[PDB]
Amino acid sequence: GSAPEAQVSVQPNFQQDKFLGRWFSAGLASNSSWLREKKAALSMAKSVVAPATDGGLNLTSTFLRKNQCETRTMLLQPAGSLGSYSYRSPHWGSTYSVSVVETDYDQYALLYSQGSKGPGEDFRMATLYSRTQTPRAELKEKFTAFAKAQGFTEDTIVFLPQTDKCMTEQ
């Protein structure tokens, strides 16, 4: 039948090693009311990408709320081709393909999460992971203009600031 590989929203022959690492919260984009109700609950956010034992990817996401920091692990599998992984929670029954459109850890990275459930149904959600601790108003304009070019407005774009409220490591 068909052949593997599928650049649905991934990057070229990039090195997955230059995509991992502890990423910090920056911004996001999607279509839902919850996206707004979450902005008010802004807090610590740290996603650490790590190779999965099942040849996939296990990233740990940090989150703060009510003076409490809880970590969330997610073991994703390969989508036929490295540089891309889809999360499938059997306990719930929801699939989501995660791809990497762009990556520039030196400043930020572009993620792509697709949602599918039932006859068709498609969802678009981009994740901008900022590895820098010094935002640039010029980049903010570069990001806003980018999402704008994709026919998307601020109404479908959330902001995820970064704050050292809690952390620990060697």
PDB file of all heavy atoms in Angstrom, residues 7 9 14 20 74 81 86 97 128 134 140 147:
ATOM      1  N   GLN A   7       4.935  14.444   5.991  1.00  0.00           N
ATOM      2  CA  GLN A   7       5.236  15.799   6.437  1.00  0.00           C
ATOM      3  C   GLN A   7       3.962  16.632   6.552  1.00  0.00           C
ATOM      4  O   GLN A   7       3.780  17.611   5.827  1.00  0.00           O
ATOM      5  CB  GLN A   7       6.216  16.470   5.473  1.00  0.00           C
ATOM      6  CG  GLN A   7       7.672  16.141   5.758  1.00  0.00           C
ATOM      7  CD  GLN A   7       8.563  16.345   4.549  1.00  0.00           C
ATOM      8  OE1 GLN A   7       9.401  15.501   4.231  1.00  0.00           O
ATOM      9  NE2 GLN A   7       8.388  17.471   3.868  1.00  0.00           N
ATOM     10  N   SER A   9       3.146  18.503   8.977  1.00  0.00           N
ATOM     11  CA  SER A   9       3.508  19.793   9.551  1.00  0.00           C
ATOM     12  C   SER A   9       4.829  19.695  10.310  1.00  0.00           C
ATOM     13  O   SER A   9       5.005  20.315  11.358  1.00  0.00           O
ATOM     14  CB  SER A   9       2.399  20.291  10.483  1.00  0.00           C
ATOM     15  OG  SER A   9       1.542  19.230  10.870  1.00  0.00           O
ATOM     16  N   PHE A  14      15.872  17.937   9.733  1.00  0.00           N
ATOM     17  CA  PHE A  14      16.388  18.479  10.988  1.00  0.00           C
ATOM     18  C   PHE A  14      16.769  17.362  11.960  1.00  0.00           C
ATOM     19  O   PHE A  14      16.401  16.204  11.767  1.00  0.00           O
ATOM     20  CB  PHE A  14      15.348  19.407  11.628  1.00  0.00           C
ATOM     21  CG  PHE A  14      14.243  18.687  12.352  1.00  0.00           C
ATOM     22  CD1 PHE A  14      13.817  19.121  13.597  1.00  0.00           C
ATOM     23  CD2 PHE A  14      13.632  17.578  11.788  1.00  0.00           C
ATOM     24  CE1 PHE A  14      12.803  18.462  14.266  1.00  0.00           C
ATOM     25  CE2 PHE A  14      12.617  16.915  12.453  1.00  0.00           C
ATOM     26  CZ  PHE A  14      12.202  17.358  13.693  1.00  0.00           C
ATOM     27  N   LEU A  20      14.614  18.812  21.126  1.00  0.00           N
ATOM     28  CA  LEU A  20      14.288  18.450  22.501  1.00  0.00           C
ATOM     29  C   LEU A  20      14.740  19.547  23.461  1.00  0.00           C
ATOM     30  O   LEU A  20      14.983  20.682  23.051  1.00  0.00           O
ATOM     31  CB  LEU A  20      14.931  17.108  22.869  1.00  0.00           C
ATOM     32  CG  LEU A  20      16.415  17.173  23.243  1.00  0.00           C
ATOM     33  CD1 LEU A  20      16.614  16.851  24.718  1.00  0.00           C
ATOM     34  CD2 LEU A  20      17.235  16.227  22.376  1.00  0.00           C
ATOM     35  N   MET A  74       3.810  12.570  29.054  1.00  0.00           N
ATOM     36  CA  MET A  74       3.058  12.072  27.907  1.00  0.00           C
ATOM     37  C   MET A  74       3.965  11.292  26.961  1.00  0.00           C
ATOM     38  O   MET A  74       4.819  11.869  26.287  1.00  0.00           O
ATOM     39  CB  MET A  74       2.398  13.233  27.160  1.00  0.00           C
ATOM     40  CG  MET A  74       1.067  13.660  27.755  1.00  0.00           C
ATOM     41  SD  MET A  74       1.231  15.040  28.905  1.00  0.00           S
ATOM     42  CE  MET A  74       0.341  16.321  28.025  1.00  0.00           C
ATOM     43  N   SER A  81       7.530   8.655  10.736  1.00  0.00           N
ATOM     44  CA  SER A  81       8.794   9.309  10.440  1.00  0.00           C
ATOM     45  C   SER A  81       9.236  10.177  11.612  1.00  0.00           C
ATOM     46  O   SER A  81       8.444  10.943  12.163  1.00  0.00           O
ATOM     47  CB  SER A  81       8.673  10.157   9.173  1.00  0.00           C
ATOM     48  OG  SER A  81       9.105   9.436   8.033  1.00  0.00           O
ATOM     49  N   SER A  86       2.587  11.224  17.492  1.00  0.00           N
ATOM     50  CA  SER A  86       1.168  11.391  17.787  1.00  0.00           C
ATOM     51  C   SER A  86       0.819  10.774  19.138  1.00  0.00           C
ATOM     52  O   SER A  86       1.221   9.651  19.440  1.00  0.00           O
ATOM     53  CB  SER A  86       0.319  10.752  16.687  1.00  0.00           C
ATOM     54  OG  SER A  86       0.882  10.984  15.408  1.00  0.00           O
ATOM     55  N   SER A  97      -1.941  14.038  16.443  1.00  0.00           N
ATOM     56  CA  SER A  97      -0.645  13.995  15.775  1.00  0.00           C
ATOM     57  C   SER A  97       0.144  15.273  16.037  1.00  0.00           C
ATOM     58  O   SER A  97      -0.300  16.369  15.696  1.00  0.00           O
ATOM     59  CB  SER A  97      -0.831  13.796  14.270  1.00  0.00           C
ATOM     60  OG  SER A  97      -0.918  12.419  13.944  1.00  0.00           O
ATOM     61  N   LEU A 128       4.142  27.446  20.322  1.00  0.00           N
ATOM     62  CA  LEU A 128       5.404  28.163  20.189  1.00  0.00           C
ATOM     63  C   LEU A 128       6.217  28.070  21.476  1.00  0.00           C
ATOM     64  O   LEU A 128       5.929  28.758  22.455  1.00  0.00           O
ATOM     65  CB  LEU A 128       5.146  29.631  19.839  1.00  0.00           C
ATOM     66  CG  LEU A 128       6.398  30.505  19.751  1.00  0.00           C
ATOM     67  CD1 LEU A 128       7.162  30.214  18.468  1.00  0.00           C
ATOM     68  CD2 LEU A 128       6.025  31.978  19.829  1.00  0.00           C
ATOM     69  N   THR A 134      14.399  36.444  27.051  1.00  0.00           N
ATOM     70  CA  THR A 134      14.369  37.854  26.703  1.00  0.00           C
ATOM     71  C   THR A 134      13.557  38.083  25.429  1.00  0.00           C
ATOM     72  O   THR A 134      14.117  38.206  24.339  1.00  0.00           O
ATOM     73  CB  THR A 134      15.791  38.391  26.528  1.00  0.00           C
ATOM     74  OG1 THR A 134      16.746  37.357  26.697  1.00  0.00           O
ATOM     75  CG2 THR A 134      16.136  39.498  27.500  1.00  0.00           C
ATOM     76  N   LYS A 140       7.504  39.491  18.436  1.00  0.00           N
ATOM     77  CA  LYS A 140       6.091  39.448  18.765  1.00  0.00           C
ATOM     78  C   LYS A 140       5.290  39.876  17.548  1.00  0.00           C
ATOM     79  O   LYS A 140       4.219  39.338  17.268  1.00  0.00           O
ATOM     80  CB  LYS A 140       5.783  40.359  19.954  1.00  0.00           C
ATOM     81  CG  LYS A 140       5.822  39.645  21.295  1.00  0.00           C
ATOM     82  CD  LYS A 140       7.183  39.777  21.958  1.00  0.00           C
ATOM     83  CE  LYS A 140       7.055  39.933  23.465  1.00  0.00           C
ATOM     84  NZ  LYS A 140       6.837  41.352  23.860  1.00  0.00           N
ATOM     85  N   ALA A 147       0.689  34.448  12.157  1.00  0.00           N
ATOM     86  CA  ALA A 147      -0.626  33.879  12.405  1.00  0.00           C
ATOM     87  C   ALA A 147      -1.685  34.630  11.608  1.00  0.00           C
ATOM     88  O   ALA A 147      -2.690  34.056  11.189  1.00  0.00           O
ATOM     89  CB  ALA A 147      -0.951  33.918  13.891  1.00  0.00           C
TER      90      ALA A 147
END
